[PDB]
Design a binder for this molecule. Sequence first.
Ligand SMILES: Nc1nc2c(ncn2[C@@H]2O[C@@H]3COP(=O)(O)O[C@H]4[C@@H](O)[C@H](n5cnc6c(=O)[nH]c(N)nc65)O[C@@H]4COP(=O)(O)O[C@H]3[C@H]2O)c(=O)[nH]1
Length: 91
Amino acid sequence: TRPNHTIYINNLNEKIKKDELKKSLHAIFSRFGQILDILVSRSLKMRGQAFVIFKEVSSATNALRSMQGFPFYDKPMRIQYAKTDSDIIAK
RNA sequence: CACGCACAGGGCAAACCAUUCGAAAGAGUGGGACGCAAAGCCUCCGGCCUAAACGGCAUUGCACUCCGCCGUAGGUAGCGGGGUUACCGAUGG
Ligand SMILES: Nc1nc2c(ncn2[C@@H]2O[C@@H]3COP(=O)(O)O[C@H]4[C@@H](O)[C@H](n5cnc6c(=O)[nH]c(N)nc65)O[C@@H]4COP(=O)(O)O[C@H]3[C@H]2O)c(=O)[nH]1
């Protein structure tokens, strides 16, 4: 549970189109601070989950806690501290 | 109608290379020429190739490597059956 710049989210409505998620997560996580990116693959394993990269931890954290169990596309998303740091975060 | 190395006069073009289109398969154009008696034309049937989109299922996945099954949809007529039309006329029991 080491706080991170990026957040893991799952139980995502696998029915909503990639582009749509992208636009609609920014939609509610931008409220918590600038985002450098939101990554999402539609592949068998990476589906149902998105990765949101905030500018700084401070926002991820602020983010996380507030929207846990949050009904998104009639499907309540679990949230967590990304296990690793996205690539650009090195940079 | 069918048949075939009947030498008549022709057609086409595998791999490859260049380039355009497509998610892709693959397709078109250009050089190439493996090999075609229809390797002309047509996707109705079987096979195989691709999964972008569409519908169903499966999946709770910790990624920035790969991304599943069915339907379907496309492609292949140079994978095959089939249909259709065809040049030559050594050959038709
Ligand atoms: N006019 C005519 N003659 C026929 C036919 N069938 C056989 N022949 C004669 O037989 C020769 C060899 O035929 P092949 O074994 O089928 O071997 C053939 C064939 O496989 C190929 N070919 C030529 N033209 C065509 C064509 O229009 N379509 C296809 N699929 N293959 C062809 O080239 C080979 C040699 O061809 P050729 O030099 O012409 O020499 C030919 C030709 O003189 C026919 O339907 N029409």
